[PDB]
Amino acid sequence: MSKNYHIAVLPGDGIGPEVMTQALKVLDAVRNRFAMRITTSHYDVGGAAIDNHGQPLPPATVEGCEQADAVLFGSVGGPKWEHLPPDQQPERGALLPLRKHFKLFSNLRPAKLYQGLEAFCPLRADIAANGFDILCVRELTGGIYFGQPKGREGSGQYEKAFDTEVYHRFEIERIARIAFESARKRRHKVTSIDKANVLQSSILWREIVNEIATEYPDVELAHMYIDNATMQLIKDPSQFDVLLCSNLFGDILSDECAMITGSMGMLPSASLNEQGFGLYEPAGGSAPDIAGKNIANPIAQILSLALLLRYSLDADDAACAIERAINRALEEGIRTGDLARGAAAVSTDEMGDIIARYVAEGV
Amino acid sequence: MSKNYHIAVLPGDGIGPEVMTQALKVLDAVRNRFAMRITTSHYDVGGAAIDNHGQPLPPATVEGCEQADAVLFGSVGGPKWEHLPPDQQPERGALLPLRKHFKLFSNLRPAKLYQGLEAFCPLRADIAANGFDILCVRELTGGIYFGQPKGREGSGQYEKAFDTEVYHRFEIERIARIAFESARKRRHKVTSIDKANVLQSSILWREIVNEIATEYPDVELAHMYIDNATMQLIKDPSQFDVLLCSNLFGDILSDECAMITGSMGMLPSASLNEQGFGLYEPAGGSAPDIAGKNIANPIAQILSLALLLRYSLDADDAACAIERAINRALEEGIRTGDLARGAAAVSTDEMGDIIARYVAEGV
């Protein structure tokens, strides 16, 4: 709840700009309720920047993001591009350059069971009913996806391929930190996932996690292996707050958490660097068929904004207030098309009206 | 009618002997019904072997296992042993030299939702109702648990720890074969789990698997990455037959499967080699606590006999009869310590008499 903030807003293609419009409505209701001074600049990126500057990521767009406290990003692909690939893509050509540009090494993906869809959840009703709220923190830049040596050697029966799981201390120290800070924002419990029986890199991970933890006495830390963690998300998801994972283990576990929500198309994602700059976006997926006719669901965008406030603009109170507006609309059955018993009671624009109205505690 | 076969029977410690005698009751009704000739010989292993012989895996046991078509193995360990060393007593001193000696590179873990146990399944009911029957085939000897170099190196910022994820073409070939062979005795489907979008070792795995697929043209092959399978196992387990897995991807997935049955006490395991020699055992362990002739549940041990018959003895007729018997028992609600409210506990011994009966044939 304060003054000073500026936000690069990059809708993109497809549903991008119609779902960012709903986010800016909710931003405006936040601006008034908490008396926060937040300005935005809009920038072209992906397909429309192809169309305007003949570029997936125009250079001035990068400047504008350099000048912002955070980037709110939409969707990128939609209509008619990528016949010429791949770093001449939208996705390839905008999103990973931005990643690389700003040192975005972490990826946070919350998975919370909203009352309203305890029936969509895949777990036994008596399990879904206990509910859950988990933040999966995933290390993005190291591990076995990028390790070196990597490659393929030989022929015949002894032909081999190999990848290396490497981690460096500087890498494990920074992602651990983001996990602990985030648990402070939350319920003060970090479960670090590893394979610290067999894996040497998993022994260092553990080790270093236990060192960093001394700096956070108010946060409880547990360790769990990846295969126990795959069972426990099914058995009792409600035991976990923050999951701290390597690149591979977080890929797996962030997807397992998404599935157990039962919704998925509703989920946000954040990518942060160690200074608090983030790029916030829906995890879901670009439009395209769905585009232009307002039946896109804006919630994942509106939830990327909630994330933006908590994590880059340290407005935790403002972030909850959007969360509770969404929880309220979902409990009432208000859908774009997720429960049309007596009609998917709302279009994209209507959905954006209702949430911004609820934040402004109107309804 | 006939046979030729011979089985080493190594009960072990604890509930090993109690549930192993129920297994052997059932081998009797099988010997009778399908007119087989199967010889058994008992050998002392782990704890029994330390007491009677002075060591957990006597030369004589080993000698006896070399004369068998398979090894049916109970449980090993109790708190009365292992104070002295790691790979010198019951578990590590018995169970893993066995595997090494016999070149057992594959691990088969079935996970099947049994009807009278549907409620214990932690998935939503309508997914539980569709049921499932999965066989996870896991590479045991290779991949990242054993690749070299493994280690840790340096100080400060770039201190690193690494593991190498190696496969050769011969390793992938032989595990893919037992997966396709297995699929032939089941529903003629193999899904191969890689992460081939980024891993060089996964890329080769996918290549060799496609090669081997052509030698089994009547078996439908599918590829899927580890994070998708992790979700699909929740959303629609019924789509799967055999999962073909590398060492780490099958350790994760095997547990996920086990959990979704909701009856992990009941599951068997098989480790096979190239010539079809297997070690068959419960996936869990003795319960010294519960050791003492008559409450331990014998179904896992018995289901182990079923696997041995199918994979080592090539008698799947006799294996399915055992699986039909257990299936009828469970839905009848009869069971050792899964449910009692009408003094509906039944002994280890009663369970064995009953399942032998149904195999013999009911009425």
Side-chain angles (χ1 to χ4, degrees), chain A residues 1-2 4-88 90-340 342-363, chain B residues 4-87 89-340 342-363:
Chain A
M1 169 160 33
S2 250
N4 264 69
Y5 313 104
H6 184 68
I7 275 172
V9 173
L10 286 57
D13 324 294
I15 51 177
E18 72 198 63
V19 117
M20 192 74 102
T21 295
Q22 313 327 136
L24 294 190
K25 294 200 185 147
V26 180
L27 182 61
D28 205 37
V30 161
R31 261 195 293 245
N32 300 317
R33 196 222 262 227
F34 296 92
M36 274 169 88
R37 287 260 40 241
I38 299 159
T39 56
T40 69
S41 299
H42 158 130
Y43 297 105
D44 292 302
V45 84
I50 302 301
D51 296 12
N52 256 70
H53 314 71
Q55 296 181 80
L57 212 206
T61 291
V62 178
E63 282 198 283
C65 294
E66 307 183 287
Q67 299 157 43
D69 300 307
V71 179
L72 186 59
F73 186 114
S75 268
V76 81
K80 68 295 190 197
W81 292 283
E82 246 253 0
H83 244 169
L84 206 158
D87 252 64
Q88 232 243 275
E91 306 163 343
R92 292 48 53 146
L95 183 56
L96 331 180
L98 243 18
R99 244 79 183 233
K100 232 156 56 215
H101 187 225
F102 299 99
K103 304 203 177 144
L104 271 18
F105 62 83
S106 73
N107 173 62
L108 328 209
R109 299 202 52 209
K112 151 154 213 54
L113 195 54
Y114 280 107
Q115 210 304 290
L117 30 290
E118 277 165 80
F120 282 13
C121 164
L123 311 180
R124 216 189 316 129
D126 75 297
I127 293 183
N130 261 20
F132 55 86
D133 182 339
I134 300 182
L135 172 76
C136 181
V137 180
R138 197 246 274 211
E139 197 287 315
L140 258 198
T141 71
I144 200 174
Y145 292 171
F146 304 94
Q148 211 41 261
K150 188 163 188 89
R152 185 162 155 181
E153 171 138 295
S155 196
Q157 290 288 325
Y158 281 87
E159 175 184 36
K160 48 176 206 179
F162 49 90
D163 308 85
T164 301
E165 171 109 76
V166 221
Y167 266 104
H168 293 83
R169 163 172 296 253
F170 78 89
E171 282 169 314
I172 311 176
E173 281 184 13
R174 51 186 201 179
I175 197 56
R177 252 153 212 156
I178 290 285
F180 281 95
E181 288 310 325
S182 296
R184 281 198 168 154
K185 254 77 192 299
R186 284 169 67 78
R187 313 189 312 274
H188 280 75
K189 189 179 160 159
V190 167
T191 303
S192 179
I193 290 354
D194 67 44
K195 209 49 219 277
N197 28 192
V198 262
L199 296 196
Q200 288 295 121
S201 54
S202 260
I203 297 165
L204 229 227
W205 187 284
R206 188 104 129 196
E207 207 156 284
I208 300 198
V209 167
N210 282 345
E211 305 179 12
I212 262 44
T214 64
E215 319 188 316
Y216 302 83
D218 59 295
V219 179
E220 177 200 313
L221 166 73
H223 302 282
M224 181 171 288
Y225 303 129
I226 183 61
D227 41 3
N228 287 116
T230 296
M231 305 197 272
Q232 293 290 95
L233 266 345
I234 287 169
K235 178 220 214 123
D236 184 24
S238 73
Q239 59 186 278
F240 299 123
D241 179 15
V242 184
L243 306 175
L244 216 205
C245 317
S246 68
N247 203 341
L248 177 61
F249 296 156
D251 198 354
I252 296 175
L253 281 186
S254 75
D255 279 3
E256 205 189 342
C257 294
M259 183 45 89
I260 63 161
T261 64
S263 61
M264 289 209 295
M266 177 162 301
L267 303 165
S269 170
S271 309
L272 291 174
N273 68 35
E274 208 38 267
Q275 298 173 112
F277 176 99
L279 141 81
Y280 298 83
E281 83 213 288
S286 188
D289 62 303
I290 246 36
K293 33 268 317 182
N294 274 60
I295 45 160
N297 185 14
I299 276 155
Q301 194 69 252
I302 292 169
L303 236 32
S304 306
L305 177 72
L307 241 52
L308 196 157
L309 287 156
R310 174 150 337 170
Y311 284 121
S312 291
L313 274 49
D314 235 79
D316 190 57
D317 59 321
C320 300
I322 303 183
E323 261 142 35
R324 297 191 308 255
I326 290 294
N327 169 250
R328 186 141 126 80
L330 260 28
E331 283 166 3
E332 294 190 350
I334 311 183
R335 279 121 229 310
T336 55
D338 334 313
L339 218 206
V346 111
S347 73
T348 305
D349 291 307
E350 258 130 41
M351 181 67 120
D353 279 7
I354 310 173
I355 323 307
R357 233 242 271 47
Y358 284 179
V359 171
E361 307 278 63
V363 195
Chain B
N4 256 301
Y5 310 111
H6 182 252
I7 294 172
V9 181
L10 274 48
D13 307 301
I15 63 183
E18 310 162 50
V19 313
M20 187 63 88
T21 100
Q22 307 334 115
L24 273 18
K25 285 179 186 185
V26 181
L27 217 211
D28 256 56
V30 163
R31 263 193 295 239
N32 277 335
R33 213 238 270 198
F34 298 99
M36 308 189 85
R37 230 309 196 106
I38 301 152
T39 297
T40 50
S41 314
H42 159 101
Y43 300 95
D44 286 342
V45 76
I50 290 184
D51 286 349
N52 289 3
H53 302 108
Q55 58 173 323
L57 183 62
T61 313
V62 180
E63 180 167 76
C65 287
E66 312 209 53
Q67 304 152 27
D69 304 322
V71 187
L72 189 56
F73 189 101
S75 282
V76 67
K80 173 183 173 226
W81 308 282
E82 244 223 89
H83 287 118
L84 236 206
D87 222 282
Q89 328 246 202
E91 296 258 4
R92 279 197 286 259
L95 227 172
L96 290 178
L98 258 178
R99 315 285 251 71
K100 290 208 246 207
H101 189 81
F102 281 109
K103 283 167 215 166
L104 272 10
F105 66 78
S106 66
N107 178 48
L108 323 212
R109 300 262 16 266
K112 157 103 206 126
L113 184 52
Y114 284 116
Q115 219 268 322
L117 302 176
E118 272 172 61
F120 292 99
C121 170
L123 304 186
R124 219 205 284 127
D126 58 304
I127 297 176
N130 289 336
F132 60 84
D133 186 359
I134 298 166
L135 203 237
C136 188
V137 174
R138 208 254 268 201
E139 208 287 316
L140 274 188
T141 61
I144 190 159
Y145 298 176
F146 303 116
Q148 286 297 323
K150 305 193 105 183
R152 142 141 134 220
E153 207 162 326
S155 315
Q157 232 200 6
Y158 284 77
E159 167 181 16
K160 73 170 179 311
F162 46 100
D163 306 277
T164 313
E165 148 72 299
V166 222
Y167 266 102
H168 312 254
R169 135 168 293 146
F170 80 91
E171 297 178 288
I172 307 171
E173 284 172 338
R174 70 199 173 175
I175 194 68
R177 302 281 212 305
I178 113 107
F180 281 90
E181 240 77 64
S182 280
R184 264 176 182 187
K185 301 158 146 277
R186 299 169 52 77
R187 330 192 323 255
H188 285 74
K189 289 197 48 163
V190 177
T191 305
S192 193
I193 303 306
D194 54 54
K195 203 53 227 300
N197 43 185
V198 280
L199 295 179
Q200 282 293 311
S201 55
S202 282
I203 284 171
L204 210 227
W205 183 285
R206 190 183 203 121
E207 239 167 71
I208 312 295
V209 175
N210 274 338
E211 256 161 33
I212 292 307
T214 68
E215 307 165 13
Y216 310 77
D218 75 311
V219 164
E220 151 192 8
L221 166 79
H223 300 276
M224 169 168 299
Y225 310 111
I226 188 39
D227 36 44
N228 232 66
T230 275
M231 311 177 82
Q232 298 300 122
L233 242 5
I234 292 167
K235 185 179 61 54
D236 194 24
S238 67
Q239 65 192 103
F240 297 113
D241 187 13
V242 172
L243 302 173
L244 167 57
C245 287
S246 53
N247 201 344
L248 171 91
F249 289 169
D251 187 357
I252 301 168
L253 280 181
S254 267
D255 288 340
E256 176 156 20
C257 287
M259 186 60 76
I260 60 165
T261 60
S263 337
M264 318 191 279
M266 295 222 322
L267 302 164
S269 168
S271 308
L272 267 84
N273 69 20
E274 328 215 16
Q275 301 102 279
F277 175 97
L279 190 150
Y280 304 83
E281 75 187 300
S286 45
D289 32 283
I290 258 46
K293 264 308 286 154
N294 277 110
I295 70 188
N297 176 4
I299 279 142
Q301 189 65 257
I302 290 180
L303 243 24
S304 287
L305 178 65
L307 263 356
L308 180 153
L309 283 157
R310 162 138 56 251
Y311 290 108
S312 274
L313 262 39
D314 184 59
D316 8 287
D317 37 68
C320 287
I322 294 180
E323 281 155 25
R324 248 171 314 152
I326 297 250
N327 187 57
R328 186 190 142 148
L330 267 19
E331 53 181 17
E332 282 199 31
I334 151 227
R335 30 158 111 0
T336 49
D338 293 324
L339 267 172
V346 169
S347 55
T348 310
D349 277 309
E350 186 158 348
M351 249 293 195
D353 288 332
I354 295 188
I355 275 76
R357 235 271 289 313
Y358 290 158
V359 171
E361 268 295 55
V363 171

